[PDB]
């Protein structure tokens, strides 16, 4: 009837890559990747903070 | 909710809105322009 | 020889003043960068088609081109518009002129008027009998071809000649090339400046960036992706299908009957399994009235029915008006009632020269009810009685419900083409799409299938009982990917 | 009858009046009516143009049919009117904007 659906710009694969990056950052650098550079930290120490 | 919104929109095409028929081609194949236009305006108003 | 029209052949479309506005208009303009035929006048005055209209242009150094002839045969057999400019006097005539075998100028009339270095552009169009002339004269410095550029033409003359123009010819002064370009219904965007002079233009159907300028109402386009249009595939040929029946419907047995029934006991004849030619009944001058409430009488030839019924009886002349949906009265309410949603036509004629004598055989008393101090009354019809004369009325009730059609009019079928986009007509039901083989098991009584939108999903071919699926031909949004117009005029299309 | 907005050649039986500039008047130009202030203008109508139009398709300017000069039409002054008031439980005095 003229009704169509457009695709999203970011495909499910691309979203998965972003959540992967955010997760990898969270695990290996804590919050430092949010503020600036991802600064590696032993996970147990990250938890201490 | 989005599926329901689209299904509702499509189903509205079956409505007459006061016209002799919801089918546009059936109006055009049966009435001359001076009369067909009236029936079509009823469908346009409803569909718009 | 041909040349490039460029951006020439735009005119001020109306006597409405505008300024500093990007206004848009639809009129018969020359399409931008299309070809125009190039004629020469050296060491060439053929008759050209006029089509829907003409841009004309010429280049001069010595005023060789002095006139035009417009008509169909240009030979004194029809009226032909003649325009001639000799020295300082413009002459316009529309006489049935006898033109030469090869008209030139050496160095029953309905109208008369009397008043390279130079480019003289003109536009000729012939709308509802009005010959509209726009033109512009401008200095040039170019011999080889039409100068490239833009400047719009004012309207100068509008002649109510009423002449059917299909061909035209020019007139040359012999001891100056000219161009002929066909106008088309192309929408434009026009840049009116501060003075109100159109200083730039964008043909809508030129190219996808021009569609983008038409969509944004702007001569400048920003970097992005713009939904300028919807691409839809067109059909190739039409497909017409009807049951291959050659029997003709017995209308003569209804309309030319020896005797009509009384209105209290009206007859109802079934018409089926036949070809119904309604042109005979409609074109016949014998009817006093032929009023349709259902469908228009000229559509009856294409359209067809599951059944048609003819309700035949005699009434008094002034009561003809009561046989209609929505009417009330002593006949409409008491002896012959139609549905207020009645579909069909009421046909009647007087029988003053047939039933009248006095003739006392005609008696009168829910929709389509036959109701077989009394309620019963009758007429004595005499030839000396207009509103008191007898009328023979036949009401044709048509059932258009989507079901197998037994009554289909005189239209020949065509062959059916599968897997191609086609304009189809199945028993009067029309639409556009791709007809394919299907696995939809219609039950024997089913003729049409439907979708959620109440549109046709599939049909049963009326000649060969197989089911065809109807899928609309591929379509979708166009979009134009473009950088800044300043960056580039190049574009890409999705 | 051709009623397209263009110079009129056949006009109905009706006497003209004098034209008054820079005042709010009820005008009628060749059958085209409206209300507004008629002023002198610098709008260069082309010889074939009789009426000008705005975005709303309303008349912007007209050519006087007796004397071929262009008059701008500016609708007569208008605006919303607001009443500034302390509650009526304090005072019935108001100011008008
Ligand atoms: C960002 C950019 O490219 N801007 C240019 C501007 O400098 C130039 O003067 C104009 C010419 O019309 O086209 C645009
Ligand atoms: C114009 O003519 C040329 C040949 O000179 C041809 O190649 C071109 O396709 C033609 N264009 C149109 C739009 O007819
Ligand atoms: C132009 O042609 C007309 C006849 O149509 C003729 O009477 C007239 O003398 C010619 N030229 C001039 C300059 O008068
Ligand atoms: C003028 O028109 C009439 C038709 O009304 C026709 O009979 C007559 O022959 C025409 N005159 C000439 C000179 O052809
Ligand atoms: C308008 O006309 C004037 C001359 O009267 C000219 O100087 C100007 O460049 C033109 N273009 C405009 C301002 O639209
Ligand atoms: C009735 O008979 C006339 C000839 O007198 C004929 O022209 C007409 O078509 C017939 N009507 C029908 C419905 O066949
Ligand atoms: C169409 O013609 C065929 C013969 O080719 C015949 O068998 C078929 O029954 C006809 N269809 C109808 C609906 O009359
Ligand atoms: C109106 O009258 C004047 C004389 O006062 C005349 O010059 C002018 O041409 C007339 N206008 C029209 C449109 O006839
Ligand atoms: C408003 O007016 C009423 C009298 O009708 C009075 O009783 C009340 O106290 C007043 N309230 C205020 C806030 O002025």
């Amino acid at each position: 009837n003229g009704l169509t659906v457009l695709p999203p710009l970011l495909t499910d694969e691309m979203i998965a890559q972003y959540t992967s990056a955010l997760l990898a950052g969270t695990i290996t650098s804590g919050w430092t990747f949010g503020a600036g550079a991802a600064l590696q930290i032993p996970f147990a120490m990250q938890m201490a903070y | 909710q989005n599926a329901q919104a689209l299904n509702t929109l499509v189903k509205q095409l079956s409505s007459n809105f006061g016209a002799i028929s919801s089918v546009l081609n059936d109006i055009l194949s049966r009435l001359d322009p001076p009369e067909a236009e009236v029936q079509i305006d009823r469908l346009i108003t409803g569909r718009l | 020889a041909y040349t490039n029209s460029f951006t020439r052949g735009v005119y001020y479309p109306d006597k409405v003043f505008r300024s500093s506005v990007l206004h848009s208009t639809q009129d018969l303009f020359l399409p931008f960068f299309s070809n125009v035929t190039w004629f020469h006048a050296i060491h060439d005055n053929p008759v050209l088609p006029f089509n829907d209209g003409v841009y004309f242009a010429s280049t001069e150094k010595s005023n060789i081109i002095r006139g035009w002839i417009f008509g169909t045969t240009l030979d004194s057999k029809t009226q032909s518009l003649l325009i001639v400019n000799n020295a300082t006097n413009v002459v316009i005539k529309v006489c049935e002129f006898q033109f030469c075998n090869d008209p030139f100028l050496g160095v029953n009339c309905t109208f008369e008027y009397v008043s390279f270095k130079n480019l003289r552009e003109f536009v000729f169009k012939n709308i509802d009998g009005y010959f509209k002339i726009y033109s512009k004269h401008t200095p040039i410095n170019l011999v080889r071809d039409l100068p490239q550029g833009f400047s719009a033409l004012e309207p100068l003359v509008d002649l109510p000649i009423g002449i059917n123009i299909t061909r035209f010819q020019t007139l040359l002064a012999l001891h100056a090339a000219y161009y002929v370009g066909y106008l088309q219904p192309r929408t434009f965007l026009l840049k009116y400046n501060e003075n109100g002079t159109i200083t730039d233009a964008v043909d809508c159907a030129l190219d996808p960036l021009s569609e983008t300028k038409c969509t944004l109402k702007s001569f400048t386009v920003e970097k992005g992706i713009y939904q300028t249009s919807n691409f839809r595939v067109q059909p190739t040929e039409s497909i017409v299908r009807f049951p291959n029946i050659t029997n003709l419907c017995p209308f003569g047995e209804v309309f030319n009957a020896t005797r009509f029934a009384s209105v209290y006991a009206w007859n109802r004849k079934r018409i089926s399994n036949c070809v119904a030619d309604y042109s005979v009944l409609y074109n016949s001058a014998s009817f006093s009235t032929f009023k349709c409430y259902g469908v228009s009488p000229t559509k009856l030839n294409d359209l067809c029915f599951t059944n048609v019924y003819a309700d035949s009886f005699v009434i008094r002349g002034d009561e003809v008006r009561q046989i209609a949906p929505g009417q009330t009265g002593k006949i409409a309410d008491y002896n012959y009632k139609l549905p207020d949603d009645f579909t069909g036509c009421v046909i009647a004629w007087n029988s003053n020269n047939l039933d009248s004598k006095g003739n006392y055989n005609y008696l009168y008393r829910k929709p389509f009810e036959r109701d077989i101090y009394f309620p019963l009354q009758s007429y004595g019809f005499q030839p000396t009685n207009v509103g008191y004369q007898p009328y023979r009325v036949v009401v044709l009730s048509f059932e258009l419900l989507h079901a197998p059609a037994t009554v289909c009019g005189p239209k020949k079928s065509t062959n059916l083409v599968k897997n191609k986009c086609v304009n189809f007509n199945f028993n009067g039901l029309t639409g556009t799409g791709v007809l394919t083989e299907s696995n939809k098991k219609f039950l024997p009584f089913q003729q049409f299938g439907r979708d959620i939108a109440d549109t046709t999903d599939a049909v049963r071919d009326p000649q060969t009982l197989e089911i065809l699926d109807i899928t609309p031909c591929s379509f979708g949004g166009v979009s134009v990917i473009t950088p800044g117009t300043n960056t580039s005029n190049q574009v890409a299309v999705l």
Side-chain angles (χ1 to χ4, degrees), chain A, chain B, chain C:
Chain A
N1 303 315
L3 277 57
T4 67
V5 177
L6 301 171
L9 181 59
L10 282 77
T11 62
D12 288 346
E13 182 177 3
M14 288 179 165
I15 300 300
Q17 289 179 33
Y18 276 130
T19 58
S20 179
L22 291 166
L23 177 57
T26 299
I27 293 167
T28 65
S29 63
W31 45 74
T32 67
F33 80 94
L39 306 184
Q40 82 270 352
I41 176 182
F43 192 75
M45 290 177 69
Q46 178 174 310
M47 288 300 288
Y49 302 173
Chain B
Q1 289 183 38
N2 289 326
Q4 184 64 52
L6 290 172
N7 287 338
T8 300
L9 181 63
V10 173
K11 287 178 180 180
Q12 286 299 98
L13 291 169
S14 72
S15 293
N16 290 334
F17 304 113
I20 62 172
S21 175
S22 71
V23 178
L24 183 59
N25 288 349
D26 290 340
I27 293 167
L28 291 168
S29 72
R30 291 189 291 161
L31 301 177
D32 289 339
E35 297 179 359
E37 289 177 359
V38 172
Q39 297 301 312
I40 294 167
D41 282 346
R42 291 178 189 179
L43 293 178
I44 291 169
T45 298
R47 289 175 174 181
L48 181 58
Chain C
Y2 293 82
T3 190
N4 190 333
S5 55
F6 295 105
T7 49
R8 301 298 185 178
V10 175
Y11 52 94
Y12 292 98
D14 47 13
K15 300 169 167 63
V16 170
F17 175 81
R18 279 182 206 78
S19 55
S20 306
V21 61
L22 311 183
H23 181 51
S24 182
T25 183
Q26 183 213 335
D27 207 345
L28 299 181
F29 301 101
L30 182 68
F32 276 9
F33 304 90
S34 64
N35 294 331
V36 299
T37 304
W38 179 12
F39 301 89
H40 297 262
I42 63 172
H43 295 292
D44 194 11
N45 60 337
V47 177
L48 293 322
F50 190 79
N51 296 315
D52 298 348
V54 173
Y55 163 92
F56 184 98
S58 62
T59 58
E60 293 285 358
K61 63 185 180 180
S62 59
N63 197 29
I64 297 301
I65 298 164
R66 296 184 185 177
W68 297 264
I69 304 168
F70 302 86
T72 61
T73 59
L74 286 72
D75 58 359
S76 195
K77 295 179 188 175
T78 191
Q79 300 86 48
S80 176
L81 174 66
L82 173 65
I83 301 169
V84 179
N85 187 29
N86 54 358
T88 60
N89 289 352
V90 176
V91 179
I92 301 172
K93 296 181 179 179
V94 297
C95 303
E96 296 183 356
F97 284 106
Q98 178 68 69
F99 289 112
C100 300
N101 289 341
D102 184 0
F104 65 90
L105 179 68
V107 176
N108 284 25
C109 302
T110 62
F111 177 89
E112 178 176 2
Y113 167 83
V114 179
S115 295
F116 294 108
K117 300 297 185 182
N118 293 286
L119 171 64
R120 298 187 292 166
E121 298 183 327
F122 300 82
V123 176
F124 311 133
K125 72 191 189 181
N126 194 44
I127 291 179
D128 299 331
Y130 294 84
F131 189 88
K132 290 180 182 282
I133 302 170
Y134 311 70
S135 68
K136 175 71 178 176
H137 299 181
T138 183
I140 61 167
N141 295 280
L142 179 64
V143 72
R144 185 176 64 252
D145 210 341
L146 288 172
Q148 182 174 2
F150 191 94
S151 174
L153 286 50
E154 53 263 44
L156 298 195
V157 178
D158 185 347
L159 307 175
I161 64 176
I163 297 173
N164 175 33
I165 297 166
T166 63
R167 297 184 178 91
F168 75 99
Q169 188 169 32
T170 192
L171 294 164
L172 307 177
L174 311 180
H175 291 281
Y178 67 92
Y179 306 83
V180 177
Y182 294 100
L183 307 176
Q184 300 188 348
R186 302 305 176 191
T187 299
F188 267 78
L189 182 78
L190 302 180
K191 183 189 172 180
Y192 293 77
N193 78 349
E194 283 69 24
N195 299 341
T197 315
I198 300 158
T199 64
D200 204 356
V202 189
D203 172 26
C204 285
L206 180 61
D207 75 285
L209 181 56
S210 300
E211 296 174 33
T212 308
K213 291 176 182 179
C214 272
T215 296
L216 303 184
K217 323 301 181 309
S218 177
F219 280 75
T220 304
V221 179
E222 304 83 357
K223 180 170 184 181
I225 174 171
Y226 302 90
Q227 184 149 294
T228 63
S229 184
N230 274 271
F231 164 80
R232 309 207 294 280
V233 170
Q234 292 295 302
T236 306
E237 63 180 303
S238 65
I239 306 297
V240 179
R241 299 256 97 186
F242 294 98
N244 58 82
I245 185 164
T246 61
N247 296 339
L248 304 180
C249 292
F251 287 109
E253 294 177 354
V254 176
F255 286 90
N256 281 316
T258 301
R259 295 290 184 274
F260 275 37
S262 294
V263 72
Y264 89 96
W266 47 273
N267 290 334
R268 184 170 180 82
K269 185 177 186 178
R270 182 183 183 202
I271 300 169
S272 67
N273 298 318
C274 61
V275 179
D277 184 344
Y278 293 99
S279 294
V280 172
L281 292 171
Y282 183 69
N283 289 334
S284 167
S286 69
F287 296 119
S288 295
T289 188
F290 195 120
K291 173 67 178 177
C292 297
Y293 300 104
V295 304
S296 294
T298 63
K299 298 288 193 183
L300 291 171
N301 289 325
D302 191 82
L303 191 70
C304 67
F305 317 98
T306 66
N307 287 284
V308 179
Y309 295 85
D311 298 313
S312 172
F313 54 92
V314 178
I315 60 170
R316 184 169 68 181
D318 284 345
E319 294 171 350
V320 170
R321 183 178 64 80
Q322 290 185 44
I323 301 172
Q327 297 297 300
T328 65
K330 54 176 65 263
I331 269 55
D333 197 63
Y334 307 161
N335 54 257
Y336 187 74
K337 174 71 171 180
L338 296 178
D340 294 319
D341 57 336
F342 171 77
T343 298
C345 305
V346 179
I347 302 167
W349 63 102
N350 75 77
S351 57
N352 197 55
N353 63 333
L354 189 150
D355 293 307
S356 295
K357 294 184 180 184
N359 185 324
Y360 290 90
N361 292 329
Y362 292 106
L363 186 143
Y364 67 95
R365 188 187 298 179
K366 295 188 182 186
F368 302 119
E369 186 180 2
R370 297 172 76 215
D371 189 7
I372 304 301
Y373 192 98
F374 289 89
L376 282 73
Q377 289 90 44
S378 64
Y379 294 112
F381 289 117
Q382 295 179 269
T384 62
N385 290 344
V386 176
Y388 298 93
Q389 294 180 6
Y391 281 67
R392 285 184 169 204
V393 55
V394 179
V395 179
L396 299 178
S397 171
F398 297 85
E399 181 176 346
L400 289 169
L401 292 172
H402 289 92
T406 75
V407 185
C408 300
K411 185 170 185 178
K412 293 182 180 179
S413 69
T414 69
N415 196 4
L416 186 144
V417 179
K418 296 179 183 177
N419 304 317
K420 187 169 85 183
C421 183
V422 289
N423 184 337
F424 55 82
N425 184 319
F426 291 91
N427 301 325
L429 173 65
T430 65
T432 314
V434 184
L435 306 175
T436 70
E437 293 181 352
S438 74
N439 60 338
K440 294 183 183 181
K441 186 178 182 180
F442 279 29
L443 300 175
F445 62 89
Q446 295 178 315
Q447 180 60 36
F448 302 94
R450 292 181 189 268
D451 210 326
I452 298 301
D454 211 37
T455 63
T456 304
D457 183 55
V459 296
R460 185 169 62 181
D461 179 304
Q463 294 182 357
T464 175
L465 303 180
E466 66 177 1
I467 307 305
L468 307 174
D469 283 341
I470 290 151
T471 307
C473 328
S474 173
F475 83 99
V478 176
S479 318
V480 180
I481 287 78
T482 182
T485 34
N486 312 135
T487 325
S488 204
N489 268 221
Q490 186 180 136
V491 299
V493 184
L494 177 72

